[PDB]
Structures are given as C-alpha cells and as structure tokens.
Symmetry: C2
C-alpha cells in the first residue's frame, strides 16, 4: 500500500535542529502538505541562513527573477502586462544540455504575512511533470541576531520508466543546490 | 597535403576566479595540459577555483579516479572492476543523477601525472548530453601570506549535439564544472 498524503511534519529535514523543527511543524502542516496520487513523490528540504527573514523573503518573493537564487536558468521572461499576483505566469529558459526548452510556471501562493510562496509547472518541463512547490521563510531570534530557516517542499509525478528514488534524488539535489545559492545571495 | 588541426587557446583568456597575476603563473600549464583540438561541432572551456588548502591535499582528492562523487554532484554511485588499477587506460562506470531512467557513463583515465598533479578523463560511452567529452584537471600551489593557496584548473572539450546551440551546451557544461569545483572547495577546506 502507497500513501495518499504527505507527512513531512513527522520527519526532520537535514540542516535544522530538533528545537528549530519543533517550532516549524505547524507551518509544515499548514503549507507543506500534499495529497498524493499513486505515481507521485514528495520531499521537504531546509536551509539555515544567517540573514534577516525580511531580506530572504524579498529574494524568494521575486517571481519574475528566479535565476537570482536558482541554478540552471538561462533567462526568465514575464508578459508585458505581468502582475505580481496569484495566477500570473513566467517562462523559464532552463539550462540542461538539451535543445532550448521553456518551462511555464504559475504563481500559486503569495502570502506576505506568513512569508510563503509557491508555484506549479504547467508546461514545458518533462523531467518534472506536474511539479508543484512551496517555499516558506521563518525568522528566529538567536542572541540578538536573526537566524532564518527556509523550508522548500515539492510534489511531482514519477515518469514511467523511472523509479521513485531516481526522481526524488534528482529533484532533491536541485533544491539543495538552489538553497545553497540562496545562502550566498542573502548572507552579507 | 597534410591536414592542419585547430586548437583551443585558453591561455589567452583569464578565467573567472583567478587574478591576472595568478593566471600568468598558470599559462604554461594551460598550454601544456589544457589545449584541445577543436572542430566546428565542438566547444571547450577552462574554469578555475581558488582553494584555501595545501595542493597535495587537493591533489589526493581529485586523483581518486574511483570516487568522483566525493567532489562532484549528480553522481548516484561509481563502480570500478574487481581488477581495477589506478592507471591510464582504466575505466569507471558512473551512475548519473539526471531525472531520466538509470544511465551509466563509462569513463577512461587519460592522464595521471603525480609530479605535475594533473589528471584527466574521457567519456567513452553512455552519456549523450556530453558526447566525446574529454576533460583535464590540474592543481597548482601558491605560497600566499605564509600559507599555501591552491588554484584548480578544469577544462573540457565536448561535441555540440545536433539541434543544440553552442552557447547552450557550453552553459550547461560550465555550470556543472563550476558547481563541482564549489563542492571540491567544501571538501578540501578545513
């Protein structure tokens, strides 16, 4: 038997302490829970950042410029009438060593109060069919300075002829590397 | 009339991540070890990375032909034969993480130079993004403010697949090498 929903609040991701995670479990339940079809897989990743959470949020909120904190993006365009609002889209030109491929992504969540955003891939990425992702930002006061934790989760289809392990390993590696780039951009 | 190959000229362009004076010390090594024959369907690049570690330590990491996953991303596993020798001509089978079904890249050791700390390999089967990939890594120690500072140079030549542009192939291969050099920094520095 296979799961029908994720339970990421039960498994501590690498890169956070138990005391940090205890403070984040409610946010994982609220924003990082997915229903699962039998052909889907899902993961939750974390990254500590020595920077104020408002600064980190201003970076990951920039839906039109994902290349600032992600690798393997040649360019990203938005329409001439683009609005920073749920339902708007972006066209991402991905670096893959294959011919030019455009990934159309839709902004799903933009919550400035809780500092949560997310997107869905609606066309053009074949390795990651029906990819959907959520990023949340969390500030901690530690001895007079802000320490930020970013949580990033996704759900995605496992292509036919792939194993779940193969798909998860690929998607997890990309997210981990992108979170490392976010660290370099946000920290001073 | 005998044919006249075209060669790369990476000694003429300072790579990002080294200063003009650092690179000036490395140009001879680039001419000696990082020069490829170049056809119109190929592209080639030279990348650099400064590492705050002794060069013998860095060399012992990049010399480990059977364990590339220690300093490279996107490798699930790497196997060598039950009779493997650490010698030019030996091969390794690299299981690559790509989001495609399982794919093995067979790679051959081309250079293993312990005096100059240079190694290199060629992909001889199984990797289609990088057909006829050939790569060289060299390690260079500098005495800098009382400590050894190391520069690693990594270059490649590769075929551009039909339906790809040169820019796209180079952008992909360069990004992979750059990210791997960052992982090498993480492993070598203490």
């Amino acid at each position: 038997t296979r799961p029908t929903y994720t339970t990421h609040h039960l498994a501590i991701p690498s890169g956070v302490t138990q005391d940090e995670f205890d403070e984040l479990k409610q946010s994982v339940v609220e924003f990082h829970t997915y229903q699962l079809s039998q052909n889907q897989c899902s993961s939750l990743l974390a990254q500590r950042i020595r920077a104020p959470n408002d600064v980190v949020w201003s970076i990951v909120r920039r839906f039109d410029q994902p290349q600032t904190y992600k690798h393997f993006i040649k360019s990203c365009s938005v329409s001439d009438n683009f609005t920073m609002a749920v339902g708007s889209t972006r066209d991402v030109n991905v670096i893959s060593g294959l011919p030019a491929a455009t990934s159309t992504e839709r902004l799903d969540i933009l919550d400035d109060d809780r500092q949560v955003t997310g997107f869905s891939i609606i066309g053009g990425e074949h390795r990651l069919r029906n990819y959907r992702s959520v990023t949340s930002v969390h500030g901690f006061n530690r001895d007079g300075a802000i320490c930020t934790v970013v949580l990033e989760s996704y759900v995605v289809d496992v292509p036919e002829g792939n194993t779940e392990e193969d798909t998860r390993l690929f998607a997890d590696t990309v997210v981990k590397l992108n979170l490392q780039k976010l660290v370099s951009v946000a920290e001073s």
